[PDB]
Design a protein around this ligand. Sequence first.
Ligand SMILES: CN(C)c1ccc(O)c2c1C[C@H]1C[C@H]3[C@H](N(C)C)C(O)=C(C(N)=O)C(=O)[C@@]3(O)C(O)=C1C2=O
Lengths: 293, 290
Amino acid sequence: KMAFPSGKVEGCMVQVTCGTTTLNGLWLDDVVYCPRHVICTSEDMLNPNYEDLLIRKSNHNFLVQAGNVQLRVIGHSMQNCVLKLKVDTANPKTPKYKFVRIQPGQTFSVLACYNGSPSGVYQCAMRPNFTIKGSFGSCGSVGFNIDYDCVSFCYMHHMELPTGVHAGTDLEGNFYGPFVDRQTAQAAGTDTTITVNVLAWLYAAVINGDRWFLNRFTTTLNDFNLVAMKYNYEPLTQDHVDILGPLSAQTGIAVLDMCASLKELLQNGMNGRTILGSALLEDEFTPFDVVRQ
Amino acid sequence: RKMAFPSGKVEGCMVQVTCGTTTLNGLWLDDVVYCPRHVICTSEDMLNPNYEDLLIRKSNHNFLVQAGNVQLRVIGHSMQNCVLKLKVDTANPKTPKYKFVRIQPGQTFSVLACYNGSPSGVYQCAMRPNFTIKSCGSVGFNIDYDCVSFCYMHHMELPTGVHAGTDLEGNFYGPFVDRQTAQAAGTDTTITVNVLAWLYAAVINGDRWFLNRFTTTLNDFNLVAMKYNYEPLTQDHVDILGPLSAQTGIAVLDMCASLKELLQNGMNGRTILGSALLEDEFTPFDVVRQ
Ligand SMILES: CN(C)c1ccc(O)c2c1C[C@H]1C[C@H]3[C@H](N(C)C)C(O)=C(C(N)=O)C(=O)[C@@]3(O)C(O)=C1C2=O
């Protein structure tokens, strides 16, 4: 399980400081994007009023540092939960880019930064409950996909949740899931295994020569869903099925048959064996991921 | 999450090298492009190759080095153990500060998987005890501060699916050869010290269910451990955990007792760091960073 090469994104990372507080920002053309809670002290983070805190601010209140050159801010607005800082210098290392909103289940790479400094990269998925099980002052660290040379920004990190997991926004600043940029207890809501991704990854195993887990049975969709939901798996919809069509077609194994395999693998375990050199099932590998590789 | 280093610094060193039939990735540093020497083998040659003979037979014009857009002029070529070095007329402006280093089995690094000179992906991995890692010319590295330590270059794909390679001075990790003869894996073992470090991570987090009162001596441990296919634990391994022992309090041998138990008893359907399985691709040093 690989992340995209992070270079294009590394050259967009900056440090943003507003008095006491410091976060990562995304520097694109002559705009720096970051989480708006950068204008909160840790105390403010209980019941912040972002309109009020923002009117009280001027361009000189924000320090933006790109390595060790300091960028002059010449304007600022807010869009939902992201702050935008207009700076006087367009970023020379700007890649071609798009902003997208992604579906739960879909995968992306995250560049974890600290104080504007890149420190690591990992692949992950938008969990069914709109969280990310990551490793994070990482706020403002962004998630993305690459399409030849087009960088799709899909995620910016904002909150660390009590249960240890991460919540965030798209690059319009709308939270993924029902969270708020506010430090009150907010329930995660129980996670579930991403069924479609598992099925795709099994198809990957077979594409690759693994057949040990196939079986003679088939199933109806409902019978599967009933069984699966009892091991905490996501319902599988007809859409999910359509997306597997490309992969069903390659290997010549029907979706519902492969669904039978999964049924049984949940029933039986691995028996010390491995699938794609993994003793655990992988659910952070989308239909599209497998198609790409 | 197990994280890779950011690959930017390395991306700016990747090139395509072509010699007749073959094409693969090279590492462009200063005015030298480094790549696996088997790039001068056709699929024929790779059976009983004579690299000395094949190399003298080559001119600078025989090598095509392609750096994204531009073609680089080669002005010299030598070989150092199993990597070829190609002198080009232009120093790479995107050269990072770097070192070439050899790593021990157990140690971790990040890999930038390229295809045809093009970066496509980056992953964390470890030098497995049998000197494998779970394309050709793709490099593995670590970063400290702004220093890139190159530690690995991919050469061979083994029948068992996994990968073998050299350091950047062209010395193979493990007893493999750059020759197309069937080559045995040599059965693996769990990297014991890394497991113990990851347990320390669990405790300095939240998970404490597996702490235990009993203590055990090195030899008794190693005897039990080696019974479930784990690596012998050395006094060196112990020293490196010293850092971690002190943070959390737990003496090394005591933590060893915990592991003893986990192997003998299982987890009882419980989990460690939200995982049912034990992790051995996280060194002492890795856990300290995180
Ligand atoms: C894998 N194992 C041999 C079996 C065999 C038959 C079974 O009927 C079951 C298991 C494993 C366990 C695993 C786990 C599931 N697994 C990790 C996917 C799981 O996530 C949960 C859960 N509530 O989170 C279970 O209830 C669970 O206990 C379960 O429903 C199982 C279960 O019903």
